[PDB]
Design an enzyme around this catalytic site. Structure first.
Site, PDB file in Angstrom:
ATOM      1  N   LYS A 133       2.673   3.293  -5.927  1.00 40.47           N
ATOM      2  CA  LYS A 133       2.088   2.324  -6.854  1.00 40.47           C
ATOM      3  C   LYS A 133       3.067   1.824  -7.921  1.00 40.47           C
ATOM      4  CE  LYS A 133      -1.325   3.332  -4.312  1.00 40.47           C
ATOM      5  NZ  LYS A 133      -1.316   2.608  -2.987  1.00 40.47           N
ATOM      6  N   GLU A 149     -16.460   5.048  -1.739  1.00 39.31           N
ATOM      7  CA  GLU A 149     -17.725   5.779  -1.665  1.00 39.31           C
ATOM      8  C   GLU A 149     -17.549   7.279  -1.926  1.00 39.31           C
ATOM      9  OE1 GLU A 149     -20.655   7.084  -1.041  1.00 39.31           O
ATOM     10  OE2 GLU A 149     -21.680   5.299  -1.806  1.00 39.31           O
ATOM     11  N   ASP A 156      -3.306  -3.073  -2.450  1.00 44.22           N
ATOM     12  CA  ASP A 156      -4.425  -2.132  -2.469  1.00 44.22           C
ATOM     13  C   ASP A 156      -4.324  -1.213  -3.682  1.00 44.22           C
ATOM     14  OD1 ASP A 156      -6.797  -0.937  -1.554  1.00 44.22           O
ATOM     15  OD2 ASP A 156      -5.722   0.554  -0.342  1.00 44.22           O
ATOM     16  N   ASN A 157      -5.442  -0.587  -4.046  1.00 45.27           N
ATOM     17  CA  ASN A 157      -5.478   0.420  -5.105  1.00 45.27           C
ATOM     18  C   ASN A 157      -4.970  -0.073  -6.458  1.00 45.27           C
ATOM     19  OD1 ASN A 157      -4.171   2.399  -2.485  1.00 45.27           O
ATOM     20  ND2 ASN A 157      -6.316   2.513  -3.129  1.00 45.27           N
ATOM     21  N   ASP A 208       0.832  -1.218   0.000  1.00 40.28           N
ATOM     22  CA  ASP A 208       0.000   0.000   0.000  1.00 40.28           C
ATOM     23  C   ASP A 208       0.864   1.265   0.000  1.00 40.28           C
ATOM     24  OD1 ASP A 208      -2.396   1.420  -0.092  1.00 40.28           O
ATOM     25  OD2 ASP A 208      -2.639   1.459   2.102  1.00 40.28           O
TER      26      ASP A 208
HETATM   27  C1  LIG Z   1       9.782   3.365  -2.205  1.00 36.79           C
HETATM   28  C2  LIG Z   1       8.925   3.429  -0.990  1.00 36.79           C
HETATM   29  N1  LIG Z   1       9.181   2.586   0.138  1.00 36.79           N
HETATM   30  C3  LIG Z   1       8.126   2.883   1.246  1.00 36.79           C
HETATM   31  C4  LIG Z   1       8.090   2.187   2.568  1.00 36.79           C
HETATM   32  C5  LIG Z   1       7.254   3.935   0.725  1.00 36.79           C
HETATM   33  C6  LIG Z   1       6.109   4.561   1.492  1.00 36.79           C
HETATM   34  C7  LIG Z   1       5.072   5.289   0.933  1.00 36.79           C
HETATM   35  C8  LIG Z   1       4.262   5.711   1.974  1.00 36.79           C
HETATM   36  C9  LIG Z   1       3.004   6.547   1.847  1.00 36.79           C
HETATM   37  C10 LIG Z   1       2.447   6.784   3.207  1.00 36.79           C
HETATM   38  C11 LIG Z   1       1.980   5.825   1.007  1.00 36.79           C
HETATM   39  C12 LIG Z   1       3.495   7.860   1.226  1.00 36.79           C
HETATM   40  C13 LIG Z   1       4.679   8.404   1.725  1.00 36.79           C
HETATM   41  C14 LIG Z   1       5.199   9.584   1.204  1.00 36.79           C
HETATM   42  C15 LIG Z   1       4.538  10.238   0.168  1.00 36.79           C
HETATM   43  C16 LIG Z   1       3.366   9.703  -0.334  1.00 36.79           C
HETATM   44  C17 LIG Z   1       2.844   8.517   0.175  1.00 36.79           C
HETATM   45  N2  LIG Z   1       4.824   5.286   3.133  1.00 36.79           N
HETATM   46  N3  LIG Z   1       5.986   4.568   2.839  1.00 36.79           N
HETATM   47  S1  LIG Z   1       7.677   4.356  -0.706  1.00 36.79           S
HETATM   48 NA    NA Z   2      -4.339   2.606  -0.154  1.00 38.70          NA
END
Ligand SMILES: Cc1nc(C)c(-c2cc(C(C)(C)c3ccccc3)n[nH]2)s1
Ligand code: NA
Ligand code: NA
Length: 215
Positions: A143, A198, A168-169, A140
């Site tokens: 993407k 929703e 997810d997604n 999650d």
């Molecule tokens: C290459 C990556 N390794 C990890 C563990 C990643 C990650 C993504 C995320 C969220 C909360 C979804 C996130 C974080 C920052 C900006 C947008 C969104 N937390 N951890 S990304």
């Molecule tokens: Na999500």
């Protein structure tokens, strides 16, 4: 300075009950649906996650992208004694929020929070976190990382036959590269679980991919 993630945490601490994971879930879902939108798996998808955990009763789960800890709370509350959740969160402030969320919920001893990027941390699991193979992986995070992190998990030897991936997604905003690979590969047995966003009035879905062994 106040942030949305700090606001979510405060709302939980005010209205949920300490050591009561179900009240923490309800508080977050109430906050995100009624007070202020936030990235959140939500209860509909949460119930599918619940069902998967209960079906396979995994002893070792890896979560990618913890954010505020909703999914970590969701999964860790269903884990047996001796079971572990490892969760990876790339943002330091969110990692801190997630820790406090789990501490409030009473689950902090079931969960290890790793602050860093998936592709840096995944190859350290065997040596540093005494992992043999994973029972379950929940994806999650970013993407565009689902497909390469899955491939990395496989080549690092962290998947065994029967390991469940739940992502997810995969429809909204969508991960069609990941989907094409796992559905098309004989290494994965795949099923799709549709669920309505929703607030956005569009259908999304979770993909379940069960590792079958190397090709
Ligand atoms: C290459 C990556 N390794 C990890 C563990 C990643 C990650 C993504 C995320 C969220 C909360 C979804 C996130 C974080 C920052 C900006 C947008 C969104 N937390 N951890 S990304
Ligand atoms: Na999500
Ligand atoms: Na497949």
């Amino acid at each position: 300075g106040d942030t949305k993630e700090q606001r979510i945490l405060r709302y939980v601490q005010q209205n949920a009950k300490p050591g009561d994971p179900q009240s923490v879930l309800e508080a977050i879902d109430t906050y995100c649906t009624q007070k202020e939108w936030a990235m959140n798996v939500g209860d509909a998808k949460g119930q599918i996650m619940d069902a998967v955990i209960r079906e396979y009763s995994p002893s070792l789960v890896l979560e990618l992208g913890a954010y505020c800890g909703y999914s970590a709370v969701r999964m860790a509350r269903l884990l047996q004694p001796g079971a572990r959740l490892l969760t990876m969160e790339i943002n330091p402030d969110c990692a801190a929020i997630t820790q406090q969320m789990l501490n409030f919920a009473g689950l902090q001893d079931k969960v290890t929070i790793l602050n860093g990027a998936s592709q840096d941390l995944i190859p350290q699991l065997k040596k540093k976190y005494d992992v043999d193979t994973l029972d379950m992986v929940f994806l999650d995070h970013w993407k565009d990382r689902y497909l390469p992190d899955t491939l990395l998990l496989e080549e690092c030897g962290l998947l065994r036959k029967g390991t469940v991936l739940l992502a997810d997604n995969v429809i909204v905003p969508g991960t069609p590269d990941f989907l094409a690979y796992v559905r098309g590969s004989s290494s994965f047995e795949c099923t799709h679980y549709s669920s309505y966003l929703e607030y956005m009035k569009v259908v999304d879905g979770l993909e379940k991919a069960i590792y079958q062994g190397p090709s």
